Write a protein that binds this DNA or RNA. Sequence first.
RNA 1: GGACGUACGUCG
RNA 2: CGACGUACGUCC
Length: 682
Amino acid sequence: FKPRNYQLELALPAMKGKNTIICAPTGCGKTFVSLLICEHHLKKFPQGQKGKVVFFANQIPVYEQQKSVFSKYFERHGYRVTGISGATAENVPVEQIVENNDIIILTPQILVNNLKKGTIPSLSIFTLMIFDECHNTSKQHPYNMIMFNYLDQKLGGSSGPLPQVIGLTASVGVGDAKNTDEALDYICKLCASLDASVIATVKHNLEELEQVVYKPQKFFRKVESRISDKFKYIIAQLMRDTESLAKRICKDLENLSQIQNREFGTQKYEQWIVTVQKACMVFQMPDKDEESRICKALFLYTSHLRKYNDALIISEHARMKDALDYLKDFFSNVRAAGFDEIEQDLTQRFEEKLQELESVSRDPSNENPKLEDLCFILQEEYHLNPETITILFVKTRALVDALKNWIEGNPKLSFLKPGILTGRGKTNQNTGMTLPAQKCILDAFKASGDHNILIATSVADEGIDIAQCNLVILYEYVGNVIKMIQTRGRGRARGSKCFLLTSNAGVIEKEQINMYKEKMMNDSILRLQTWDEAVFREKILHIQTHEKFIRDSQEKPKPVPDKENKKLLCRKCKALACYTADVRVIEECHYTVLGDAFKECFVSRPHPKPKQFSSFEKRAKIFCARQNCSHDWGIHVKYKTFEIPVIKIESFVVEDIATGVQTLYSKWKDFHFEKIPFDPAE
RNA sequence: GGACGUACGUCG
RNA sequence: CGACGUACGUCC
Ligand SMILES: [Zn+2]
């Protein structure tokens, strides 16, 4: 625990009573700098008053690491260190646990909720508000909401003992600015939103700083794509047959979107299929008998087209065998559900060509040249040095499993052990990885462990304790300047590589302008560090006044809701589920329904990941009680002592009884109606 | 169930 | 100069 020569120079502007934007590229250095700043701040206070330094941390793993190191560093002098999260703030007194403690490591959403309902009426209780990854301050971030409350308390005219912002970062970022005159504007806007006048960056001890944060050399591997594609042809033929079968029941199908020319296996086609799906979900017929079957068949057709587009997107970046395995997994998952006349025709049409797909996929003469170049550079780097660890980055969760399967099923490379980690992702699906499943993978990834290469998603981009890699390879990965710095900064070993393998010149141009934006942000920081403290304070005060005027001017009230009785039909089956006359709002965020006429309209299923949000408990997942629907309506929780199902309007269509038209919403804020609050009775 | 961020992309 | 879709990630 020896303080380095650069950490003192980084903390010297912070030990003056002024808010700082300290930016260090190293990992442990920021933690040691925050600990030294906390140690210096908890000693300047005289007798009769103590400090209330609060260190905000977004992610749970980095929060637990910071809490562990803070306890191990401060539980010797009589400094009570605690920590609040979702598994901590169930029924604890938040104001009491803030009062009787000194270092609070809460998660900023909890603090925003506390400032919202009835807790901590003024932020003058704390005296040192440190942020982890302060560059995440953005349009409506929880960090930005805390800073909005701080700026409101400051400019309200009742500014008392305001705390100090020592929010550390690793990269300020440019965002979307082209020129230096807009990059400096964005940096000044971030520095005003964080309410500071000093941006600390190590300049004197650069020779003693470059020995631990040794940056990797980048290498672009732009190569051509596949020319002979006997897989895309037959998949596009099956997609054309499915589209003609969909157009057999819907005459005006081409006029349901504004797409001029669509290509199969593209993001344009993936947008068009969702557009035509949301267009045919609101189809109306004045019989209400065969309309259900028509919309159900149309939903099945659009689901099959979307899955074929996703399979083509997977096959364009990976092999044909794993794409066939994904299609077979989808067909097996839909096979376990009900089987009508509509699904059986698509299933037999897929089974009539599955043998042809397998015979084309088994041929090793049409493999991906991206995967060939990746295996070539991997075996080259492992022949040059066998003790290299890679944190190879792929963007899609459905493609990191593909990369793991390609690494496992390959006779050319046998020294690679998959250590693939994904992350949480969706909280209402049986996908992704859990916190202990990720922690055991991160602990089992050393220089001598049973893992030498892991296929990371974007979870490894943010603040997380990973081993010192030297073989960063980005397989079709595209990001901003912040993502590029956070990805390049991971390979801080004594000699590393930052390979970028894309089949597009667009991603190479994006990486080139990202490096240009990094150099421009460095020049902008060097220019901004030369300004005086008096002019910069007036500039950030003007920017804060303008932002406060913009925030207080755009106060749009709730419009007058249509006090009508409308029914919420199903999104897939278009069956009568319930009315809007009985919709209860629990905590201005969750919407439930009541009555004995709804309990026989849905079925239950065990939930994959049960947890609690703030006061509920994930008990079951609900589904439509039709013959073959299997539609995710919502979830089933227990509020205080009674179980209620809370639904989402996203899997719903709002049909009006008076007029007869049916609209389509996505979120609950867009739906305006006579919302009755939840009563504990009935 | 909800809130938030990033990247790509499509219409106006 | 603005909504919308997807993918990814974080949180309550
Ligand atoms: Zn249904």
